[PDB]
């Protein structure tokens, strides 16, 4: 470790911890910057050499974290928890957690290499006869309504990404648990859960899911019916799980892309404004500037020049390999902040632009916190910020204000269309956002050994989402591996928490804004009072317990499903009424059912390609 980056000495009391924390800060930003810059260089340009450089940056990071971690322990192990400065305790608490820096050098190099090769496997996989995930497979899952085309993209992707990840994923799991066990955690999953600082976290989440499950079951039954009328009885079983490739999305995780097949009242205004965006010639640039302008309408910060100069806002045309999966980047120098997105001109992509910009906004607002506290109050708060604004943006009235929806209507049919569309996006995602980390928590705990990765993945997929793989799978397949966050080692339960929390946020901001109609017709655009209430959250970083931040924001100190249930209530009732009238079976009691192959599959793919 460079002499300038090493910890000096400090007294072993709270006054010394403060100076220790201050000293840490100046060197930490340098080390984080070097590591984020190296990750940037690799992910906007995947080469063997950028991976080597990123690996060396990561090793430096581990070195730094071991030296300051061990010094914090040496000086403050018996006492940090009794510090009266609460922010100080949080800082030390962080520094003293070593993670992968617990491993010996050789295992740290194994770990860093595994992260790099798992990433490269996922981001460079392709399906031949060659398509990329982004844009090619994405566009197909979204837009194609051909059974065989969808199947070829689904199977190709899962086979191409998942199969080779499996041996690496095994080795990564063992090394990750080895590292965090030295921090005191029974497994890495227990470390990830600790961020919520809640002893009844898992029971609380199960309780949430129980209240939400009936909305998902009724939405599932209604979409299953629409798919049945289009694909017929051979490929859709009105009492069985839905084939996992027909829902608009590679992971079936949100269903917005099939809205055009399930829209209840077609002669109402068309709420998918993609065609209008294209017709009007929108590009990436316009999308980010319109999101930006929402944030400044609230008197939040604009994106700085460095964001505009450095971001990657479209997939590069030189065909260099990039990680297309959208992401928001804090360089830790309080100046560089960027988004890396292979933006496509589509309505769901306008939301993803808002999603990523919500991360940027948090980073802008907390940049002056001590480095350890530049995080959301919990990970689910970071995930909710952009989605809350996107809730206002998607409303018909808002879209009318930004030229994206010429016709205006306010009737019970138009409401149902909008709430249904919103339900495809938000409700359909619930089981998937809940299940992913159940699977990974079982893998980290050893309950799911490698001999059951796929079995236990499809157990949970059918249990919660009521889908089934459209070709047979066995334990040579690693279908969890074909989802970004798994090889990328990004936790998922944050997105389940976010999907509840954002409705709590929306409710509170809309009330603060002075709005007084139906929750799902609220637009907080240009509300400077909503803006101020949101800014208090963002500015807090992780300096304070998330329960208390939440309580100051919305008036309650817990996750609560009531705001989501209230926003969706008109369509929740309507879906239940429609499924009753059609005689539907709620759920999938034919749990073993899987569709047949299409005749002449895959031989005839060239006919529909
Ligand atoms: C869209 O209409 C709703 C419903 O409007 C009320 O009832 C209708 C049948 C009609 O008689 C309207 O004139 C009524 O105002 C609006 O929601 C109401 O908004 C007012 C004030 O903003 C509020 O006091 C009422 O409680 C609301 N009713 C409900 C059911 O919440 C709504 O604001 C209109 N939305 C848009 C985008 O214009
Ligand atoms: C597209 C969105 N992409 C992520 C994201 O923004 O979360 C990216 C990659 C994973 C994390 N991420 C970040 O950018 C980030 C950086 C720092 C943070 N402190 C937190 C996140 C996504 O996966 N999403 C969006 C909601 C559903 C979920 C998904 O597509 O599965
Ligand atoms: C992507 O990364 C590669 C490194 O793997 C970059 O290659 C370097 O290119 C510059 C300019 O041509 C040279 O000065 C270096 O000597 C190259 N290094 C190696 C190891 O080849 C490449 O420039 C990057 N592409 C972009 C657009 O950033
Ligand atoms: C798993 O599936 C593939 C084909 O779908 C097959 O080649 C393989 O032998 C199957 N069985 C095992 C144990 O891998
Ligand atoms: Cl999380
Ligand atoms: Mg989508
Ligand atoms: Zn996010």
From Swiss-Prot:
This is Angiotensin-converting enzyme. Belongs to the peptidase M2 family. The chain holds residues 30 to 644 of 1306 of the full protein. Inhibitors of ACE are commonly used to treat hypertension and some types of renal and cardiac dysfunction. GO terms for biological process: amyloid-beta metabolic process; angiotensin maturation; angiotensin-activated signaling pathway; antigen processing and presentation of peptide antigen via MHC class I; arachidonate secretion; blood vessel diameter maintenance; blood vessel remodeling; bradykinin catabolic process. It is linked to Ischemic stroke: A stroke is an acute neurologic event leading to death of neural tissue of the brain and resulting in loss of motor, sensory and/or cognitive function. Ischemic strokes, resulting from vascular occlusion, is considered to be a highly complex disease consisting of a group of heterogeneous disorders with multiple genetic and environmental risk factors. Its main location: membrane. Ubiquitously expressed, with highest levels in lung, kidney, heart, gastrointestinal system and prostate. Dipeptidyl carboxypeptidase that removes dipeptides from the C-terminus of a variety of circulating hormones, such as angiotensin I, bradykinin or enkephalins, thereby playing a key role in the regulation of blood pressure, electrolyte homeostasis or synaptic plasticity. Composed of two similar catalytic domains, each possessing a functional active site, with different selectivity for substrates. The active site is at residues 356, 485. Keywords: Calmodulin-binding, Carboxypeptidase, Cell membrane, Cytoplasm, Disulfide bond, Glycoprotein, Hydrolase, Membrane, Metal-binding, Metalloprotease, Phosphoprotein, Protease, Repeat, Secreted, Signal, Transmembrane, Transmembrane helix, Zinc. The record marks 488 as: Not glycosylated. Residues 11-589 form the Peptidase M2 domain. One of its GO terms (cellular component) is endosome. Induction: Up-regulated in failing heart. Glycans are attached at residues 9, 25, 45, 82, 117, 283, 410, 474. Disulfide bonds join 128-130, 324-342, 510-522. The keyword Heme does not apply. It is found in: Cell membrane; Cytoplasm. GO terms for molecular function: actin binding; bradykinin receptor binding; calmodulin binding; chloride ion binding; endopeptidase activity; exopeptidase activity; metallocarboxypeptidase activity; metallodipeptidase activity.
């Amino acid at each position: 470790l460079d002499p300038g980056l090493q910890p000096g000495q400090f007294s072993a009391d709270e006054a010394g911890a403060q100076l220790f924390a201050q000293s840490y800060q100046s060197s930490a930003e340098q080390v984080l910057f070097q590591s984020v810059a190296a990750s940037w260089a690799h992910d906007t340009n995947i080469t063997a050499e950028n991976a080597r450089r990123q690996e060396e940056a990561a090793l430096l990071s581990q070195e730094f974290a071991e030296a300051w971690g061990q010094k914090a322990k040496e000086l403050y192990e018996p006492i940090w928890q009794q510090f009266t400065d609460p922010q100080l305790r949080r800082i030390i608490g962080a520094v003293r957690t070593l993670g992968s820096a617990n491993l010996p050098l050789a295992k740290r190099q194994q770990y860093n290499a595994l992260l790099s090769q798992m990433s490269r496997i996922y981001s460079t996989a392709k399906v031949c006869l060659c398509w990329s995930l982004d844009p090619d497979l994405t566009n197909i899952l979204a837009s194609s309504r051909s059974y065989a085309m969808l199947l070829f993209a689904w199977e190709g992707w899962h086979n191409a990404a998942g199969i080779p990840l499996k041996p690496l994923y095994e080795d990564f799991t063992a090394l990750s648990n080895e590292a965090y066990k030295q921090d005191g955690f029974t497994d890495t999953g227990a470390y990830w859960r600790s961020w919520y600082n809640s002893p009844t976290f898992e029971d609380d989440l199960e309780h949430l899911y129980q209240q939400l499950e009936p909305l998902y079951l009724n939405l599932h039954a209604f979409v299953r019916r629409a798919l049945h009328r289009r694909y017929g009885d051979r490929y859709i079983n009105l009492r069985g799980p839905i084939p996992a490739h027909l829902l608009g999305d590679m992971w079936a995780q949100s269903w917005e892309n099939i809205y055009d097949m399930v829209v209840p009242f077609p002669d109402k205004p068309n709420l998918d404004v993609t065609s209008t965006m294209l017709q009007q010639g929108w590009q990436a640039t316009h999308m980010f500037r319109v999101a930006e302008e929402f944030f400044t309408s609230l008197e939040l910060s604009p994106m700085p020049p460095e964001f505009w100069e450095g971001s990657m806002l479209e997939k590069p045309a030189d065909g260099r390999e990039v990680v297309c999966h959208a992401s928001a980047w804090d360089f830790y120098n309080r100046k560089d902040f960027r988004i890396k997105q292979c933006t496509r001109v589509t309505m769901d992509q306008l939301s993803t632009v808002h999603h990523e910009m919500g991360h940027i906004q948090y980073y802008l607002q907390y940049k002056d916190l001590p480095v350890s506290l530049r995080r959301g109050a919990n990970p689910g708060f970071h995930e909710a910020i952009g989605d809350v604004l996107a809730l206002s943006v998607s409303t018909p009235e808002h879209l009318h204000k930004i030229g994206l929806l010429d016709r205006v209507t306010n009737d019970t049919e138009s409401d149902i269309n909008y709430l249904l569309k919103m339900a495809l996006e938000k409700i359909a995602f619930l089981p998937f956002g809940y299940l992913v980390d159940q699977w990974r928590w079982g893998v980290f705990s050893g309950r799911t050994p490698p001999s059951r990765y796929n079995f236990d993945w499809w157990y949970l997929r059918t249990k919660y989402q009521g889908i089934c793989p459209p070709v047979t799978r066995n334990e040579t397949h690693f279908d969890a591996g074909a989802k970004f966050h798994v090889p990328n080692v990004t936790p998922y339960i944050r997105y389940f928490v976010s999907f509840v929390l954002q409705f709590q946020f929306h409710e509170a901001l809309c009330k603060e804004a002075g709005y007084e109609g139906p929750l799902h017709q609220c637009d907080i655009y240009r509300s400077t009072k909503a803006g101020a209430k949101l800014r208090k959250v963002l500015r807090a970083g992780s300096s304070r317990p998330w329960q208390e931040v939440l309580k100051d924001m919305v008036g309650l100190d817990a996750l609560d499903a009531q705001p989501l249930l209230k926003y969706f209530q008109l369509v929740t009732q309507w879906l239940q009424e429609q499924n009753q009238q059609n005689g539907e079976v709620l759920g999938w009691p034919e749990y073993q059912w899987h569709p047949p192959l299409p005749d002449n599959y895959p031989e005839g793919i060239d006919l529909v390609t």
